Amino acid sequence: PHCSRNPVLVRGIGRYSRSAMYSRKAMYKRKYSAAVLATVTKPVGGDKNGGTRVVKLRKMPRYYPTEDVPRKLLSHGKKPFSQHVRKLRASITPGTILIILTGRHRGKRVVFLKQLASGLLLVTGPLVLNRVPLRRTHQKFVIATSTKIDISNVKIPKHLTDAYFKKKKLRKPRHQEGEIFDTEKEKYEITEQRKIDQKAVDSQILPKIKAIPQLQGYLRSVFALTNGIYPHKLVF
């Protein structure tokens, strides 16, 4: 199984033509001329009785609803969210300082690390400077500041991923009693593994942060529009 052998230049237009790919593929000398299980039967299992049992499983249903809707019409490919594409802005490369616009944090300045596998971008302005742990954020709710920090060979742990930073819920109790789900008052003390996962990266970005002078106090600060400070007049 070779690779694509036809380098694109524009989306869906290969560089080599139809006849030029007939000779790159050598299709002239590979032209050709050459050319269930309903189920398994079961043992009988009983005295005075033979006749190994019927070839049938996954039987006809016990019930049909009184009405049914017609089948859809397929239309095209409209692939699901696990397969779409991952797009970044060119103003966001790793190491960049970001500004959180809509969180609980709302203007805390954070250090961008990695764009995760399903769109959200992994970020921490480190917990000793901000109050920002290894949270995900979303791309279009941050502001890429034109300052960066050069962390191009630090580390990133492979185990912390999109299914790491998820919220947890298992809806067993359906009975109307005065406790709200018995697990909703509780802030998670499962940090005991997430705390170790930060000190693996909290202890190797503060060397980078405490190399350029003012930056650690800049990260302690928060962002605010004050009086004549207008965005569109501001070089971020």
Binding site: L9, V10, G12, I13, G14, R15, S17
Partner: protein, 51 residues
């Protein structure tokens, strides 16, 4: 009705020559670009060789 002149392969359902009309013109204005970028450099490189 989709729009030819806006998406590919609705042109090509109507005009198959419009693909090879298009990579014959994306190739040549990628090589005319190279012919002018190298000309602007290699002229002023010898100018930078003097001074």
């Amino acid at each position: 009705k989709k729009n030819p002149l806006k998406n590919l392969r609705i042109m090509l359902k109507l005009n198959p020559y419009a693909k090879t009309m298009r990579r014959n013109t994306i190739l040549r204005q990628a090589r005319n670009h190279k012919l002018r970028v190298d000309k602007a450099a290699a002229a002023a490189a010898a100018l930078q060789a003097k001074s």
